[PDB]
Amino acid sequence: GSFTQQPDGQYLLKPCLSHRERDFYLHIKDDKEWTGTGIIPKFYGVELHEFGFGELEFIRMENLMYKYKRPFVLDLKIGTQTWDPETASSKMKKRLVVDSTSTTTSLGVRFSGMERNIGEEKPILYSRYLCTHEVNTRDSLKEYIKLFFNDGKKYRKELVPYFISQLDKMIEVMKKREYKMFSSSVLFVYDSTTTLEDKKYNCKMIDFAHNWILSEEECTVEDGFLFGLNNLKSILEDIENEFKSL
C-alpha cells in the first residue's frame, strides 16, 4: 500500500516507512547466502530522495517482472501468525481471525492474491481475501497454486522444479534462526511467453517491514516461517506428482 502496486521498469523504489525492512536488507547485504543465492530481490541500496521538507529513505531493488509480456503473479504470505510484537491493538482481532480462518495457523502459509494474464487482458485478478473462503484448506491452496501454473492453454509443469529449488535455498538459510519475519511473502512470478531458457520466472522472499534481527533485539513470539516454507515445498512436490498424470 506504500506505492501503486502495478511492472515493466527496471526497479522498485520502495519508501522506508520504518527501520525494519531497510535494516534487514543492510544486514544481509554482505552475506553471500542471502545475496548470491537469488532468494530475495537484488538490493541496489538505500537512497534518500527529496520528499516533503527534506528527504525520505527508499530501498532500491529489482523489479522482478521487468520486461514481462504476460505476467502471472501469486503472493503467498508465510508464517503461522501475521501479527508481531509491534502490531497495533486495533488490528489484532482481525489478524487473529484471518490467521485462524485461513491456512496460516495450520500450514504456516496462505494464499494472498493472484493475477493471471491469459490473452484477454486486462488480466484475471484473484483477491487476497479468498484465503478465508475459497482457499482456506491445503487442498484448495494446492488447487490455486496449480491455477497459477495454468497459463490459459496448459499447465507449465516444467517451471515447478525451479520453484522448489528456490524454496530449498530459502529453507537452508532460514534454518539458521537469525531473523524472524512476519507478514512477509514468497512471490511467484513468470511471463507466460517465456521459455525455460529465457528465465522469465522468479521466486523470491519479499516484504520485510516486520523483520526482527535476533542478534540485535528480542522477539519472543514465533513466526513459524520455516514450518510454512516446508509446507509450501510439500505442496509444490505434490503438484509435481499430480502434473505427471497429464
Ligand X SMILES: O=P(O)(O)O[C@H]1[C@H](OP(=O)(O)O)[C@@H](OP(=O)(O)O)[C@H](OP(=O)(O)O)[C@@H](OP(=O)(O)O)[C@H]1OP(=O)(O)O
Ligand Y SMILES: Nc1ncnc2c1ncn2[C@@H]1O[C@H](COP(=O)(O)OP(=O)(O)OP(=O)(O)O)[C@@H](O)[C@H]1O
Q: How far is the CB of 241 from ligand X (least distance, A)?
A: 30
CB 84 within 8 A of CB 96: no
Residue of 23, 84, 115, 207 interacting with Mg ion (CB under 5 A): 207
Cβ proximity to Mg ion, 84 vs 207, nearer residue: 207
Q: Which residues share a beta bridge with 114?
A: 74, 126
Residue of 109, 130, 187, 219 interacting with ligand Y (CB under 6 A): 187
Q: Give the footprint of ligand X on residues 63-92 (CB under 6 A).
A: 91
User: Near ligand Y by CB under 6 A, which window of 2-10, 80-88, 139-147, 218-226?
Assistant: 2-10
By CB under 6 A, is residue 4 in contact with ligand Y? no
Residue whose C-alpha is closest to residue 166's, from 194, 191, 190? 190
**Grid coordinates standing for 168?**
530449498
Write the interaction track for ligand Y spanning residues 30-69; mark x where CB under 6 A is met and - where it is not.
-----------x-------------------xxxxx----
By CB under 6 A, is residue 94 in contact with ligand X? yes
* Exposure class string for 188-206: b at 16+ Cβ within 10 A, else e: bbbbbebeeeeebbbbbbb
The verdict on whether residue 91 carries a ligand-binding annotation is: yes
Q: Residue 94 touches which of ligand Y, Mg ion, ligand X, none (CB < 5 to 8 A by kind)?
A: ligand X
For the four alpha carbons of 195, 146, 209 and 2, in that order, the dihedral sign comes to positive
By CB under 6 A, is residue 128 in contact with ligand X? yes
In angstroms, the Cα distances linking 61 to 5, 70, 143, 191, 240 are 15, 21, 31, 19, 31
Where are any strands of DSSP class E within the chain?
11-15, 43-51, 54-62, 71-78, 109-116, 124-126, 179-181, 185-191, 201-206, 211-213
Q: How far is the CB of 155 from ligand X (least distance, A)?
A: 27
The verdict on whether residue 205 carries a ligand-binding annotation is: no
Q: Residues within the annotated binding site for Mg(2+)?
A: 207
Binding site for ligand X (CB under 6 A): 1, 91, 94, 98, 112, 128
Q: Residues within the annotated binding site for 1D-myo-inositol hexakisphosphate?
A: 5, 77, 91, 94-95, 128-129
